[PDB]
Amino acid sequence: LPLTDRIALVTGASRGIGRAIALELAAAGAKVAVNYASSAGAADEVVAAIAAAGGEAFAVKADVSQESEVEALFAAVIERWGRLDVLVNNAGITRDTLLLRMKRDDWQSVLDLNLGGVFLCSRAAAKIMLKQRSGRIINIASVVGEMGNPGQANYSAAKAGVIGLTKTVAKELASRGITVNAVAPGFIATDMTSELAAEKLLEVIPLGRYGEAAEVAGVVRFLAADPAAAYITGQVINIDGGLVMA
Amino acid sequence: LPLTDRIALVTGASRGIGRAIALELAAAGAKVAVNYASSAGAADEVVAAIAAAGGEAFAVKADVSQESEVEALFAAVIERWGRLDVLVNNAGITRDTLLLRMKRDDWQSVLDLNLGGVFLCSRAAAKIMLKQRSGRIINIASVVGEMGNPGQANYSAAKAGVIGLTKTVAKELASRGITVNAVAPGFIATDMTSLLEVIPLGRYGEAAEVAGVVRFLAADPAAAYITGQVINIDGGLVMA
Numbered sequence: 001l002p003l004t005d006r007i008a009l010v011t012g013a014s015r016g017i018g019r020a021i022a023l024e025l026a027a028a029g030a031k032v033a034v035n036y037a038s039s040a041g042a043a044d045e046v047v048a049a050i051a052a053a054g055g056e057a058f059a060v061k062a063d064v065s066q067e068s069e070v071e072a073l074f075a076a077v078i079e080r081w082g083r084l085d086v087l088v089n090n091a092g093i094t095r096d097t098l099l100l101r102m103k104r105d106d107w108q109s110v111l112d113l114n115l116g117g118v119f120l121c122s123r124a125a126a127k128i129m130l131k132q133r134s135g136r137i138i139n140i141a142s143v144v145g146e147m148g149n150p151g152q153a154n155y156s157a158a159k160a161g162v163i164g165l166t167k168t169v170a171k172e173l174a175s176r177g178i179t180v181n182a183v184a185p186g187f188i189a190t191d192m193t194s195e196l197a198a199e200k201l202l203e204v205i206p207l208g209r210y211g212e213a214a215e216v217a218g219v220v221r222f223l224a225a226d227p228a229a230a231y232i233t234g235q236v237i238n239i240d241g242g243l244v245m246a
Numbered sequence: 247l248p249l250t251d252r253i254a255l256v257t258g259a260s261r262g263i264g265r266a267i268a269l270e271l272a273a274a275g276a277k278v279a280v281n282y283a284s285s286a287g288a289a290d291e292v293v294a295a296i297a298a299a300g301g302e303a304f305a306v307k308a309d310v311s312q313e314s315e316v317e318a319l320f321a322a323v324i325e326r327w328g329r330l331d332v333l334v335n336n337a338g339i340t341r342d343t344l345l346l347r348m349k350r351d352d353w354q355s356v357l358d359l360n361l362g363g364v365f366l367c368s369r370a371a372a373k374i375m376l377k378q379r380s381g382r383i384i385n386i387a388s389v390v391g392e393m394g395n396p397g398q399a400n401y402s403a404a405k406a407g408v409i410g411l412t413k414t415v416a417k418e419l420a421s422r423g424i425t426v427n428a429v430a431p432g433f434i435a436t437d438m439t440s441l442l443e444v445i446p447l448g449r450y451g452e453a454a455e456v457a458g459v460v461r462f463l464a465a466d467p468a469a470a471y472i473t474g475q476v477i478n479i480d481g482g483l484v485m486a
């Protein structure tokens with residue numbers, strides 16, 4: 001099992017894509033730290049399901065937009081298990097509104113969490129991973145970042161910023177063999193980034209359906225665990241049903 | 247002259263690229279509002295040069311990371327000429343450091359200006375251009391936002407974000423015929439820049455060259471059908 005004796009930290013893992021990722025990394029042998037901010041009951045469920053299928057997991061509370069909370073988050077993982085092999089930055093929110101009506105706090109809270117959180121957690125991971133001379137970071141971005149989407153100037157700015165950040169961090173950490181990649185989901189059935197745009201655009205998803213959380217989790221597991229993915233870095237993989245090919 | 251009787255606001259226009267863009271948009275006929283953050287003299291030097299070319303310009307002090315100052319910036323332009331045809335989001339800064347040692351304040355100051363300022367100014371511009379049913383927004387991004395660059399996790403995440411914002415804003419404003427586009431310079435000779443073997447054309451770009459692409463998007467009738475795009479002006483540095 002490719003992640004036996006490895007540690008994964010997944011941010012915003014109480015539900016949807018993040019929950020699915022936590023499960024798939026555990027399935028593949030990792031001990032998973034399941035981070036949440038408010039969904040504690042759901043987060044406990046994720047730990048219980050990992051325990052149930054034979055793995056090890058624990059839930060850690062932390063608001064990933066907050067610099068000292070991120071410090072305590074990583075400190076808790078190293079204290080429990082001594083190392084960090086895989087970080088998946090998945091935590092994010094939407095606060096949809098046309099730009100004209102977009103209030104500054106709807107811009108800021110999306111930027112601070114979706115982009116700032118990736119910065120804070122990538123910084124903390126880099127320290128530990130540079131010391132190990134190994135690691136893989138996977139950031140969940142989103143096709144909205146590549147193509148834009150009415151109502152979502154904050155979300156798309158953030159997810160595009162996550163893609164740029166991904167590439168810079170790939171270049172800084174490459175000399176130690178640390179890989180840094182992004183997975184860009186399209187519209188996923190149960191973790192829908194824009195429920196309103198899915199409807200309008202279902203007609204032009206070439207595969208004719210929404211994606212599943214478990215599918216996004218597989219591309220993530222591949223990037224995190226497959227030896228072939230040791231040579232992939234600074235990339236964005238769309239899993240979007242052919243939504244964005246350009 | 248394609249910009250006669252049109253009004254342009256250029257943020258960060260006291261020096262370098264922003265200066266060359268303000269000069270160029272003025273030579274194409276526009277009244278230009280010259281935003282600066284603290285260079286009152288350099289700003290007025292640009293205003294002066296526009297006036298000796300026989301143009302109209304005025305300077306406005308505003309830190310475009312600040313909600314309340316951008317609002318003041320845009321009110322002062324509307325109050326003076328009663329319209330806004332072209333916004334060029336140019337102001338930006340760097341705070342280079344490897345990720346390992348990047349301080350939270352150095353992340354946040356680049357993000358607040360280079361990305362937050364683009365949100366604030368494009369929001370003020372959307373309000374006006376929606377009412378006009380015309381306008382052009384041009385954002386100065388950077389090829390470093392497309393390919394990443396060690397030392398610049400903050401600047402590249404901010405410039406990549408400008409590119410994503412550009413696309414969403416383009417889609418929101420398209421139905422009234424407003425174009426929204428980005429121009430991504432590579433390495434240009436400026437204060438921000440004061441080996442080379444990776445630029446196929448074998449030289450840095452000149453600030454005037456960036457200014458020509460901006461003017462083209464801002465003024466040329468063919469650019470009415472260009473929106474949601476990023477044009478690299480980078481000597482071949484990044485071919486994508």
Ligand SMILES: NC(=O)c1ccc[n+]([C@@H]2O[C@H](COP(=O)([O-])OP(=O)(O)OC[C@H]3O[C@@H](n4cnc5c(N)ncnc54)[C@H](OP(=O)(O)O)[C@@H]3O)[C@@H](O)[C@H]2O)c1
Nearest residue numbers: 258260261262263283284285309310337338388434436438
């Ligand atoms: N190779 C390059 O130079 C390169 C490559 C790609 C993209 N770009 C982008 O091009 C744009 C212009 O860069 P440049 O090289 O011309 O810059 P550079 O000469 O430093 O000039 C910066 C300008 O923006 C202003 N500014 C700084 N902080 C501001 C704030 N908070 N609010 C409003 N204005 C502020 C400065 O005004 P003051 O004089 O009052 O401080 C000055 O006018 C930036 O977005 C930059 O990131 C440059």
